[PDB]
Design an enzyme around this catalytic site. Structure first.
Site, PDB file in Angstrom:
ATOM      1  CG  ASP A   1      -1.949   1.053   1.259  1.00  0.00           C
ATOM      2  OD1 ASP A   1      -1.919   1.987   0.417  1.00  0.00           O
ATOM      3  OD2 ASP A   1      -2.779   0.957   2.181  1.00  0.00           O
ATOM      4  CB  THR A   2       2.386   3.206  -2.800  1.00  0.00           C
ATOM      5  OG1 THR A   2       1.227   3.358  -3.630  1.00  0.00           O
ATOM      6  CG2 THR A   2       3.256   2.019  -3.296  1.00  0.00           C
ATOM      7  N   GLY A   3       0.038   4.183  -0.557  1.00  0.00           N
ATOM      8  CA  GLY A   3      -0.679   5.264   0.105  1.00  0.00           C
ATOM      9  C   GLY A   3      -0.663   5.232   1.621  1.00  0.00           C
TER      10      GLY A   3
END
Ligand SMILES: CCOP(=O)(COc1ccc(C[C@H](NC(=O)O[C@H]2CO[C@H]3OCC[C@H]32)[C@H](O)CN(CC(CC)CC)S(=O)(=O)c2ccc(OC)cc2)cc1)OCC
Lengths: 99, 99
Positions: free
Chosen positions: A25-27
């Protein structure tokens, strides 16, 4: 590997000797796992998301292996809807976005 | 290009004739943009993350330009704290995770 995003980027992780599935999850600034029993001391923390804030247990310097790549860092445990691997550990396994 | 994850993966996007900053978010199935008055029909939707659910307006077939790469798909608009580019559009610009 190289992971396309037509499906959720779910991988197997190993933490506290147990295998689980988790979302890359790059967010997510931080790594947040569903309720589980980890050994060692922990301190209460709060983190916020799309729906508001939740109470979590912060475990520091925790060993976690993500798709065969080892990481040691902060792991938050609490009522997240899904196990998420956040940037604090994605950086450690050398993960980048590419297009 | 290649985007490291030491910092939030924030990029410039252009939507509805306006430029904005948005997060490239592999953990987001769908794209959620900050409140904006877009023309056209929409449908109510609810989306959930850490902390619960929020109410958003779903607009379909919206064009968004992400770092010079064009994408067209469903865009949700609502009281999100951050513009989020989700997998529905990241796939269209050829975005992958790599480690
Ligand atoms: C500084 C900003 O202010 P705030 O603290 C919060 O702002 C935000 C809000 C959201 C995000 C992105 C969000 N990240 C996140 O939750 O990260 C946590 C962990 O690490 C912290 O880093 C920043 C927050 C902390 C996920 O990547 C994406 N999500 C899904 C994911 C949820 C676990 C899988 C289910 S999703 O957005 O819910 C979503 C659900 C369904 C969709 O389509 C149907 C599209 C999107 C980043 C910053 O305000 C507090 C009120």
């Amino acid at each position: 590997p190289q992971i396309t995003l037509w499906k959720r980027p779910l991988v197997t992780i190993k933490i506290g000797g147990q295998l689980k599935e988790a979302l890359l999850d790059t967010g997510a600034d931080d790594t947040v796992l569903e309720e589980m029993n980890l050994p060692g001391r922990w301190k209460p923390k709060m983190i916020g998301g799309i729906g508001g804030f939740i109470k979590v247990r912060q475990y520091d310097q925790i060993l976690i292996e993500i798709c065969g790549h080892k990481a040691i860092g902060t792991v938050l445990v609490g009522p997240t809807p899904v196990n998420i691997i956040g940037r604090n550990l994605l950086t450690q396994i050398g993960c980048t976005l590419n297009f």
